[PDB]
Design a protein around this nucleic acid. Structure first.
Lengths: 424, 79, 22, 27, 59, 129, 169, 188, 141
RNA sequence: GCCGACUAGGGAUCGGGUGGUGUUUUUUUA
């Protein structure tokens, strides 16, 4: 029964792990042994006779199951060996197993085919002859057939199929036709609604952007992946999705209207409710900050700045507040004189708002970020506003004073930084 | 014809208390507000005693065969 | 409540009765 | 029919609908 | 404080147009709903399409 | 004289099958009752059955497909041997291979088939056929 | 009050520290609810994923204090959910196995109540366990049943299906 | 299984079991997609299967409940319907690979048949001695009701002409109904 | 189901499924406990006590509300019956039927009911003796 | 008058309880 078959599969895995540490794994004899497994894998009389049995025998044929079970073991053993021992990973050593690989590729069982795909991905870099090279081409065709028959891309076989397609385009000079690439990308788009089981699909999507293959639906992927970062809870999916879109945004052509709308999302996604979603946006914005054109930075500098001071000033997560302050800190050196001049007006403006206490803390806290990023004495007028503002806070510290405890604490913080900057 | 495993909610409500799929009380409890002091008291639907306001010593309900009849003027809510 | 109350049900009650009896 | 002589509010139930207890999607 | 109020405090109208990304409808994505509530809507959405298909047979 | 809960359940199931009723409510429930029921069910004589817990003894409702000829609880509790089992079947079942005698042994409640295969013995409970 | 005081465990985990910090913040914000919140203290926390992908905060609590928590569990749970979105806040006490399992289930279904419990015995022999829940707060628990099965399976190691009668979900 | 047949004499074996499908749970119903080799099996869970794949290709399920019976459509072959033990009927579409609509009845339905001449129209064998005629698009109401049986109807079938339906019941009778009439014209 | 009578009545109370206190109940568990002691000090049996608490104080049940039976609550506080509720009532009824009988020496119906009452006492007295709540030497009158 | 561990019912009636309804009834003496 199936439960026992699952138990057998476990032992065969336990046996395989033991071989990895077995000294025989380092010899050439194992390759012959795996070779052996593959080829081994491939009326008057009744008128007189009393019958006392009313039960008929039930027909069963488990020979095929034995063939697949033995076939699976040899593939897993072979892949384990060649990965562990580099010398065995050679055309001469693995020429004989190619006819077995192609046969295993047509097998009904998915698991053996999955192992067939895993080894083939391992052998993609390896050189091969004309007869031994078509297997890569044929498998590329087969995985599409698997995708065609399969209802959903979220399948263990199909996901590995996409993994081989990624390697196929990445390494092999031959590339699939655009229409086939269009079809497969159409199928992953709905199944992308549940990114948790599409990690391998992302690696395939990474292959497409890596070679810069032009494909219409790939633009839909970028929009879909962008949402997945700020929404999906898993740490890994945000990282794998974060890089592909960033490369797509920075490599593929886009109309100017789209570019702004792409940067519309990040500043708006900065206000995402979930703390993790806002954090996912930090790495992208940090990526824009660290490596981008000065004109692109100057175009978007003023927007990124005051969007960051928000989450720095008002945000439920201290880390999001801390990171945004760090993000602002690494930007202010990079902003142009004009762009920084706009920053100079902003910090001065809130400090000028003596009437509102909420505006005040922004000026002082943002002034602290201004220091240690641009330094002191770059803008004397702003420094005087802070010093005057600090004086008016510290003077009114009496009981009759109406100043809130956050305000006097804020004045002390900016005051302390001002001491470290200057000895006046 | 009736589905014994999924009987209609009405059919259950119509039917006797105890013979049901899962027998449970049809009785219930009330908040009754004292007319005199406006204080609220908890009273059982089939209360067997003349429940009296502790503050007013005023009769809120009178026992009967089944449900106890709430006294005239006593405003009541299901609790 | 008073008409419904009984003088003699609880071990404490007869203990009171046992107290006054002697 | 006898109950209908006194009760004010008894919706008439279409027997094509009595067998239905509920549907997931309401239109 | 909100983002809009700060950008108003400048009162310049040339600083305002520099930060173009900030002006427009909020594109922050809504918090995901529970899966069944999502698929229930998905089931409802699918039932619409299937109805439209079979209606072609109506004529 | 009141009867055991097992006997009451068995009689209810037999009665309903014989009147053609397709659902039966059994009350009270028990592990002996429930176990005997999956034994029946594995032998296919009964279909889906469902358990209400009422925070009390509990209730069962059993789907019937009409293949139950007669089921009963045998008494008194006399012990049964392995190699001898067969004759009791010949005594307690209509024919050689038709019906299943239920027996509670050290390995649980089971028909005599899984019993002789496991080489286990114990107490007889009843019959189903 | 420091977050550590709220944490009975001598070595508080980081997430325990955040939740205790949120709890004391609620205390400070509260004018008089603090009077009930201050005595209340929790043993530990455990965060578990769900099929939908979100997480659930199972707070391990003492039973005699669990009573007091249950008195203020509604407001406290809503507030913590505000502090920790993407996470379902639940109070479970730490405690025969059938008794404790049903008590854990009762703690889970709180504030709502279990109308019943069903078990279906299939033809092949598969067992379907189900729990019938009242419609007091049907809308809210209709956003949370997946969390309920995840919690029950994770803790008790049992497969269970929470349903809500009187409505076709 | 494969069966040797005498339909044609253009040849002249391999008769018997051809392939087997192991399942974690018991199977209670089976139906085959007509256009393609794909078929579905209904047990504890409704599964979509391919002939050339030993494992269930796709898993369909509205909920934890088990499925008692299924029937593919003969005109819109991509649409499937199923019957559950909780007195429910569930509709599915293969083009979406998901269930589409569900309705709960006062009683379980034992069999479901789709009209060969009406793609959107099907009949259901119910356990209240009744057979219910349904339009797929609007399931809030039935098209027609058949009442002449005295025991639960166990099987129902459309005439391939689509203008009669036959019902089988536990009451030792077979009844034939005209599609537009609610009472049997005949009893066997 | 009646003994000593042909009645088959099934009238009784149906406990609710839920074994948790009502969500609507908002009074302290202890305050019940002193309150139970107060009537029981006044002289109401656990039976009447439960009637008053539910009728006027929303106490649906003594176990669900505080987790302990009122007897055990009373027993915890040093209070209990001498002889059980059930037997105690039978004795007085047997007393009253006898106190009738001497004055009216022609009540042939009443004397019969006495035998029914007395035999019920003997069975109930027998079993309470077995559980040891009643020490063995006890004999009826 | 077949009997029983035994199904679903029909009308009428006695006592109690729940719900509805509109005629008798009736009014801060009860």
């Amino acid at each position: 029964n199936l439960r026992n078959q699952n138990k057998l599969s476990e032992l065969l895995r336990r046996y395989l792990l033991g071989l990895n540490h077995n000294s025989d794994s380092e010899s050439e004899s194992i390759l012959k042994f795996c070779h052996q497994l593959f080829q081994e894998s491939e009326e008057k009389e009744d008128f007189f006779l009393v019958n006392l049995e009313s039960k008929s025998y039930t027909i069963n044929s488990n020979s095929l199951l034995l063939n697949s079970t033995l076939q699976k073991f040899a593939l897993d053993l072979l892949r384990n060996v060649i990965t562990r021992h580099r010398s065995f990973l050679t055309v001469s050593h693995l020429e004989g197993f190619i006819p077995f690989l192609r046969d295993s590729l047509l097998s009904e069982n998915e698991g053996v085919v999955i192992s067939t795909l895993r080894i083939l991905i391992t052998l993609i870099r390896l050189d091969f002859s004309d007869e031994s090279s078509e297997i890569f081409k044929n498998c590329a065709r087969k995985v599409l057939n698997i995708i065609k028959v399969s209802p959903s891309t979220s399948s263990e076989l199909c996901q590995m199929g996409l993994k081989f397609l990624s390697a196929f385009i990445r390494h092999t000079d031959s590339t699939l036709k655009d229409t086939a690439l269009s079809y497969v990308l159409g199928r992953v788009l709905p199944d992308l609604n549940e990114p948790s089981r599409q990690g391998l699909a992302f690696n395939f999507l990474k292959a497409l952007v890596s070679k810069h293959i032009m494909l219409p639906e790939l633009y839909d992927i970028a929009d879909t992946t962008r949402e997945i970062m700020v929404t999906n809870h898993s740490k890994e999916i945000r990282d794998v999705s974060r890089s592909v879109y960033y490369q797509f945004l920075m490599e593929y052509d886009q109309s100017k209207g789209r570019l702004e709308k792409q940067f519309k999302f990040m500043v708006d996604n900065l206000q995402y409710p979930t703390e993790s979603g806002r954090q996912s946006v930090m790495e992208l914005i940090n990526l824009i900050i660290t490596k981008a054109n000065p004109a692109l930075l100057s175009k978007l500098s003023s927007s990124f700045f005051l969007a960051l001071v928000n989450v720095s000033f008002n945000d439920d997560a201290p880390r999001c507040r801390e990171m945004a302050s760090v993000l602002i800190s690494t930007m202010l050196p990079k902003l142009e004189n004009k762009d920084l001049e706009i920053v100079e007006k902003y910090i001065a403006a809130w400090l000028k708002q003596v009437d509102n206490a909420s505006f005040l803390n922004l000026g002082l806290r943002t002034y602290k970020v201004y220091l240690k990023s641009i330094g002191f004495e770059h803008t004397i007028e702003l420094d005087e506003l802070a010093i005057k503002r600090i004086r008016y806070i510290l003077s009114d510290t009496s009981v009759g004073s109406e100043h809130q405890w956050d305000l006097v604490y804020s004045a002390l913080n900016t005051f302390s930084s001002y001491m470290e900057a200057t000895e006046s | 014809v009736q589905d014994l495993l999924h009987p209609t909610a009405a059919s259950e409500a119509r039917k006797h208390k105890l013979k049901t799929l899962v027998q449970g009380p049809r009785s219930y409890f009330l908040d009754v507000k004292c007319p005199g002091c406006l204080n609220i008291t908890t009273v059982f639907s089939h209360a067997q005693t003349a429940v009296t306001c502790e503050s007013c010593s005023t009769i809120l309900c009178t026992p009967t065969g089944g449900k106890a009849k709430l006294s005239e003027g006593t405003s009541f809510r299901r609790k | 409540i008073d008409k419904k109350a009984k003088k003699d049900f609880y071990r404490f009650q007869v203990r009171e009765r046992k107290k006054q009896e002697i | 029919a006898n109950e209908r002589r006194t009760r004010k509010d008894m919706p008439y139930i279409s027997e094509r609908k009595k067998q239905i207890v509920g549907t997931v999607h309401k239109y | 404080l909100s983002l809009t109020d700060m950008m108003n405090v400048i009162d310049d109208r040339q600083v305002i147009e520099n930060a173009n990304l900030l002006k427009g409808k909020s594109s922050t994505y809504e918090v995901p709903l529970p899966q069944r509530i999502q698929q229930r809507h998905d089931r409802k959405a699918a039932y619409e399409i299937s109805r439209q298909e079979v209606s072609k047979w109506n004529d | 004289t009141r009867s055991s809960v097992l006997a009451d359940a068995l009689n209810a199931i037999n009665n309903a099958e014989k009147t053609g009723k397709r659902q039966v409510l059994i009350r009270p429930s028990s592990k002996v009752i429930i176990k005997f029921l999956q034994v029946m069910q594995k032998h296919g004589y009964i279909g889906e059955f469902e358990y209400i817990d009422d925070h009390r003894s509990g209730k069962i409702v059993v789907q019937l497909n009409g293949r139950l000829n007669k089921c009963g609880v045998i008494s008194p509790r006399f012990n049964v041997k392995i190699g001898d089992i067969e004759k009791w079947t010949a005594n307690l079942l209509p024919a050689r291979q038709f019906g299943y005698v239920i027996l509670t042994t050290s390995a649980g409640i089971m028909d005599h088939e899984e019993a002789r295969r496991k080489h286990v013995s114990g107490k007889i409970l009843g019959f189903v056929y | 009050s420091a977050p550590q005081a709220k944490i009975l465990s001598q070595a508080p985990t980081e997430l325990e520290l955040q939740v205790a910090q949120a709890f004391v913040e609620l205390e400070n914000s509260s004018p008089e609810l603090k009077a009930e919140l201050r005595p209340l203290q929790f043993k530990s926390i455990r965060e578990i994923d769900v099929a939908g992908g979100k997480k659930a905060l199972a707070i391990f609590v003492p039973v005699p204090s669990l009573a007091g928590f249950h008195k203020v569990q509604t407001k406290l749970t809503r507030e913590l959910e505000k502090k920790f979105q993407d996470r379902h806040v639940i109070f479970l006490a730490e405690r025969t196995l059938t008794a404790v399992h049903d008590k854990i289930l009762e703690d889970l279904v709180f504030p709502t109540e279990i109308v019943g419990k069903r078990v279906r015995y299939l033809v092949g022999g598969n067992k379907i366990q189900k729990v019938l829940l009242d419609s007091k707060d049907v809308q809210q628990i209709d956003y949370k049943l997946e969390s309920f099965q995840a919690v029950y399976n994770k803790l008790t190691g049992k497969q269970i299906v929470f349903e809500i009668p009187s409505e076709t979900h | 299984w494969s069966i040797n047949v005498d339909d044609y004499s253009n040849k002249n074996n391999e008769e018997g079991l051809i392939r087997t499908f192991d399942g974690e749970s018991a199977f209670q119903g089976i139906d085959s997609h007509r256009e393609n080799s794909t078929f579905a099996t209904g047990g504890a869970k409704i599964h979509l299967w391919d002939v050339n794949r030993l494992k269930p290709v796709s898993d369909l399920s509205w909920g934890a409940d088990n499925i008692t019976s299924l029937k593919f459509n003969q005109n819109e072959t991509d649409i499937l319907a199923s019957t559950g033990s909780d007195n429910s009927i569930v509709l599915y579409d293969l083009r979406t690979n998901s269930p589409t609509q569900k309705i709960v009845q006062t009683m379980r339905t034992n069999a479901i048949c789709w009209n060969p001449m009406e793609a959107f129209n099907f009949v259901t064998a119910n356990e209240d001695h009744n057979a219910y005629y349904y339009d797929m698009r609007n399931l809030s109401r039935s098209l027609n009701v058949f009442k002449d049986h005295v025991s639960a109807v166990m099987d129902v079938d459309f005439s391939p002409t689509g203008d009669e339906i036959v019902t089988g019941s536990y009451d030792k009778s077979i009844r034939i109904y005209k599609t537009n009439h609610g009472h049997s014209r005949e009893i066997y | 189901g009646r003994m000593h009578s042909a009645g088959k009545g099934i009238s009784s109370s149906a406990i609710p499924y839920s074994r948790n206190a009502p969500a609507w109940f908002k009074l302290s568990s202890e305050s019940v406990i002193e309150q139970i002691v107060k009537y029981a000090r006044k002289g109401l049996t656990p039976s009447q006590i439960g009637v008053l608490l539910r009728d006027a104080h929303g106490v649906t049940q003594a176990r669900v509300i505080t987790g302990n039976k009122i007897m055990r609550i009373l027993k915890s506080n040093g209070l209990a019956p001498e002889i059980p509720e059930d037997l105690y009532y039978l004795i007085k009824k047997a007393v009253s039927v006898r106190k009738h009988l001497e004055r009216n020496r022609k009540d042939k119906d009443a004397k019969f009911r006495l035998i029914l009452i007395e035999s019920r006492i003997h069975r109930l007295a027998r079993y309470y003796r077995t559980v040891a709540v009643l020490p063995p030497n006890w004999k009826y009158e």
